[PDB]
Design an enzyme around this catalytic site. Structure first.
Site, PDB file in Angstrom:
ATOM      1  N   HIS F  20     -10.812  -7.043   6.981  1.00 21.44           N
ATOM      2  CA  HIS F  20     -11.735  -6.334   6.096  1.00 21.44           C
ATOM      3  C   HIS F  20     -11.057  -5.896   4.791  1.00 21.44           C
ATOM      4  CE1 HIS F  20     -14.934  -2.903   5.623  1.00 21.44           C
ATOM      5  NE2 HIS F  20     -15.177  -3.939   4.840  1.00 21.44           N
ATOM      6  N   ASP F  28     -10.473 -21.225 -12.357  1.00 17.47           N
ATOM      7  CA  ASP F  28     -10.703 -22.423 -13.147  1.00 17.47           C
ATOM      8  C   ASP F  28      -9.311 -23.004 -13.386  1.00 17.47           C
ATOM      9  OD1 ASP F  28     -11.413 -20.221 -15.911  1.00 17.47           O
ATOM     10  OD2 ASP F  28      -9.469 -21.145 -15.470  1.00 17.47           O
ATOM     11  N   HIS F  98     -11.579  -9.176 -18.532  1.00  9.79           N
ATOM     12  CA  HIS F  98     -10.732 -10.236 -17.996  1.00  9.79           C
ATOM     13  C   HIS F  98      -9.305  -9.754 -17.732  1.00  9.79           C
ATOM     14  CE1 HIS F  98      -9.393 -14.215 -17.026  1.00  9.79           C
ATOM     15  NE2 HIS F  98      -8.539 -14.254 -18.033  1.00  9.79           N
ATOM     16  N   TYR F 120     -13.581 -18.368 -18.270  1.00 15.54           N
ATOM     17  CA  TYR F 120     -13.838 -17.265 -17.351  1.00 15.54           C
ATOM     18  C   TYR F 120     -14.579 -17.638 -16.080  1.00 15.54           C
ATOM     19  CZ  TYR F 120     -12.597 -15.068 -21.732  1.00 15.54           C
ATOM     20  OH  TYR F 120     -11.958 -14.731 -22.902  1.00 15.54           O
ATOM     21  N   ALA F 121     -14.363 -18.860 -15.611  1.00 17.61           N
ATOM     22  CA  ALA F 121     -15.000 -19.310 -14.383  1.00 17.61           C
ATOM     23  C   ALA F 121     -14.088 -18.947 -13.206  1.00 17.61           C
ATOM     24  CB  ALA F 121     -15.231 -20.815 -14.426  1.00 17.61           C
ATOM     25  N   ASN F 122     -13.893 -17.646 -12.994  1.00 13.69           N
ATOM     26  CA  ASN F 122     -13.063 -17.142 -11.896  1.00 13.69           C
ATOM     27  C   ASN F 122     -13.786 -16.001 -11.201  1.00 13.69           C
ATOM     28  OD1 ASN F 122     -11.141 -17.241 -14.603  1.00 13.69           O
ATOM     29  ND2 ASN F 122     -10.352 -18.488 -12.919  1.00 13.69           N
TER      30      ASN F 122
END
Ligand code: RIP
Ligand code: RIP
Ligand code: RIP
Ligand code: RIP
Ligand code: RIP
Ligand code: RIP
Ligand code: RIP
Ligand code: RIP
Ligand code: RIP
Ligand code: RIP
Ligand code: CL
Ligand code: CL
Ligand code: CL
Ligand code: CL
Lengths: 131, 131, 131, 131, 131, 131, 131, 131, 131, 131
Positions: F20, F28, F98, F120-122
């Site tokens: 948990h 990216d 970011h 910013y594809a994270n």
């Protein structure tokens, strides 16, 4: 500090693990060391430390039942050959061809590299037992 | 075999990686070695090899810009203190208290243990640059 | 900084451990390196550094008693084959088939990769002794 | 063999993991390398490879968004200082004191040692992004 | 970021070390990987990535001299079998029994696992030379 | 073969150890990976695999209680930002700058690199609990 | 947390790497484990977990194509022998002498130790394929 | 076999590396050992070997300049407290609370576990110097 | 085979090194394990083994001085909470917030993962002394 | 602390992994230990611990089905030879030449070194089974 025994920390660790028949090698600056065999290099410069000084210290700190050397030492290094015969007068001294000698070094627990710059100044000390 | 440079294989590897300002320590048989610092033990027996012999060989193989030593050496080991002042006449020699000296050894790349059995016979050699 | 010997830190460490008959390999950009053999890659781009530049530096820092190369070098790479003959004019030079050559690289202490982009530009330098 | 990219196998592995803002260092033969930072030594002899040649190859194989050098380079190494300005026209060039510079190298993914024997011929290349 | 070459960091590292005759394996989801051989798993879910997509990328980034596959692929996977024949028109394609194929994978530098869920969609790419 | 769960062997191992609140990152092609954090690179070529495909598989194999992404994604990458909102409609989505996002990746158990070539594809997936 | 597959993190990792024909062993508390083979001990106390419970979970999470057990089990442990026949009715079951069985465990990817305290309660599960 | 010094191989290695002020710990069967500190366990059964037997052997093989123990030993273990006073009558003996004592064990090179089953039967031996 | 003590080999190794005040953790399937702390996973499937069964075995093989659990266990898992109170009647039982509980797990020698699928079924056992 | 089993932490770990037929060796101070075999040195001084005392403890903590000693013990060490016969009344005692004996030790899981200073005071205990 440790009160007794050999002063060199690397060597003390090797002597500590010696059991009956284990072998260590004292070598001149040119002997090749087999892959997998521990190498302790004490050399500082040519002739320092000498083969004789190193062999003497080990003889005093290790129980040796047999000494092995290359027959070639009698031909190219009488000085050191005599020293060896004298130092280990009570032990068994066997001479083999240098080629065979090198083969035997593969089973050594360690090779101690000295600064000795004379031919075939190498020997194998085989551990004895204290009882 | 290697044609040039220091004969000792362990030491050659350390000198090879030295960059400007990196430090190595030459020490007597009693100096404690900080955890994490590489220790190369060249000692064979008391006085062999001596602090002087070791320092001389290194001076010849390493470019030293500064030497650091403990002030206590001037009081308990004038012999070796003078040797140091003479050997590194062209370099900067700084004396600190032995306590501080020990603190500085934590940043050394290695400690070379000699067989020297005299008080405060230790020094830090700081690498210079060849251009 | 280290004052004498080869400039490359990785190479200095290899040379420091060489004993009589130990082998190192100088290779072109395409030679495969056997598993278990240390690879020191000095290439920057095709032709830099060249086989000739590398072999010359090594000849100056290492005592070579014998050189081994692939017979195919004579027919496919005359310039380099001649260079070797000239550089190691005093040493024994042995030519084996490239296949046998590759097999021998398994016993090398290291393979030095150059930026050489010409056929069979590889050789084995077998260490000699200083005394 | 690998068709594209930098020829050096060690460098290829470093470039492969570079992410936006990661840093690598190109150094002269004297720059000290912080503990823990990977060192790739390409040096063969003084002046080979040269700082300029190494920087040129990296420039075309790596997307650089910012270059960092020591201010001292402008005064002590005008030739290489101009090379940088000219080579990294579009990139942002930042100058710091040599001391601050060394501090930044502790964050580098690697230090590439060249055979450059001229003062302050060092620089940090900060990785950009391809989209 | 790295400008040229394969995008995958793990793979770039494998390609970087390839020498003439070195082998890598592209495998479907069921091929067992011999002990000691590095496994780079790119699978996401069944069919992604496909054998074809992975083989196409490697063909573009690696100099392939010879391709090896199992004869069984012609019987149970004609679609991929034809693909392979067309992609590697210029190269030599050898078919062995799947059993022999598996024995050869033990000599590979790496096995690349794809998400391919079709029978015998495996192949060994043997590296060529760039000169 | 394993009947259930995620197909990728590397990822299956990471999911197996999740407790948990543990976090994993999907990145990216340009996101740098903090030292000490495991990197599993699934990229093949630009756009393969895509951010969306990777996130979808993880969402189906891992119990996610919270998702963290950089605020910049909403304006610079609308398509993926929308996708993220749809896929994780049930869970809580938190947007940070970011820079702050990157600091958070220090605590991740792993960074999964995709072939995504859009800014910013994270995102960070925070593990939930099954009871 | 991981939504699907086997619950044990250690076992999930082993199943993730299984390829066609790979083998894993389920053992009683007395089976010796060959050197080099990974041991995952799930035992808590005698009889917990039981051989039957462990085998049942694995059967549900792994595609088994063949089961190997010692012949001695049929006579010395009838209850478990019957269980094995029922659970793996579809697959091929092969009985070898216990001595031969043990030699086979040398090739296993792992030995799962259970708390089973009844003789010859061991078996090798050979991985099948999902397509 | 090693002729001089302490018989135990593990202990010989520790003594070999001791420098001035380095510490080692002799402990009863219940003392916790800090993470990172090497533990050499000599216990065979309750009372064998005893704290007294162990401390006596160490006193003979190591140059001790100072002894440190927990004040609680005087009140809870009079026999052993007196033994220490007598054995190290010439050295400086310092008593700290058991809590502070435990904190000091973090700096020890090793903890030697005895079979002693009596309260606070622990001490720190601080190495002295031989010159 | 080992005659006495806990049956599980991994656990026996952990118990063997326990000193006074050392801590081990028994956890449910969802508790996260701090980095650096050894994880011994005994889970087979949900509910097997149970928190109660595991705690009972440890209580019998380990000298427990103090027990620590999260206060939340009294609210969401009264069944296991009562169990704990009864099993450790003679020992001190301290309740902390689950958040503080987790911080303490970072100092544990190991976390034992059970198959327990109920909320807050975790506890820290603090080792006592046998004299 | 661990309530039951052998007190020595090192030995406890070895016993924990013992399976049917595994072997451990109890040795005098002179027996050489094969490479790769774990060595646990309990010696403190000549005669402490004694062969008999060590063998007695192992006998009660380990289920032994067969004992192996060197024939030479019957002639050179009659006292310890009788001890063995008496201690292992029910077990099968096999005698071999000292040379064959040493060969068998290469298969031992560990060698326990005692302080025994009498000839051929060595034996191999072969693990039995508890059911
Ligand atoms: O140095 C050693 C020998 O002593 C001899 O000099 C021949 O080469 C090496 O094997
Ligand atoms: O041996 C060193 C010093 O040289 C001095 O003898 C004091 O102890 C150690 O620090
Ligand atoms: O590159 C080497 C050789 O030098 C030759 O080019 C053939 O391929 C490799 O073995
Ligand atoms: O070599 C580098 C610099 O370029 C300068 O020479 C000073 O020493 C090192 O830091
Ligand atoms: O997956 C591989 C093969 O491609 C075939 O499917 C048979 O099983 C495995 O060996
Ligand atoms: O690739 C990542 C981001 O997504 C953005 O592209 C900026 O550079 C890196 O931090
Ligand atoms: O425990 C195993 C067997 O199942 C049998 O009990 C004999 O000893 C071991 O080999
Ligand atoms: O065993 C040690 C002490 O000697 C005392 O018994 C208290 O517990 C441990 O700290
Ligand atoms: O599983 C643990 C707890 O016991 C609780 O269920 C909350 O999540 C995890 O921290
Ligand atoms: O010590 C052992 C033997 O017991 C005998 O003393 C001979 O040497 C070693 O093998
Ligand atoms: Cl000693
Ligand atoms: Cl050198
Ligand atoms: Cl590349
Ligand atoms: Cl135990």
């Amino acid at each position: 500090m440790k009160k007794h025994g050999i002063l060199n920390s690397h060597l003390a660790k090797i002597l500590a693990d010696l059991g009956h028949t284990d072998k260590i090698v004292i070598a001149d600056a040119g002997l090749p060391v087999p892959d997998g065999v521990l190498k302790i290099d004490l050399s500082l410069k040519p002739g320092l430390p000498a083969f004789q000084d190193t062999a003497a210290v080990l003889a005093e700190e290790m129980a040796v039942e047999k000494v092995i050397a290359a027959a070639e030492i009698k031909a190219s290094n009488q000085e050191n050959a005599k020293f060896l015969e004298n130092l280990f007068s009570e032990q068994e001294i066997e001479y083999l061809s240098h080629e065979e000698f090198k083969l035997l070094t593969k089973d050594a627990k360690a090779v101690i590299r000295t600064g000795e710059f004379t031919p075939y100044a190498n020997c194998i000390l085989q551990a004895g037992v204290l009882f």
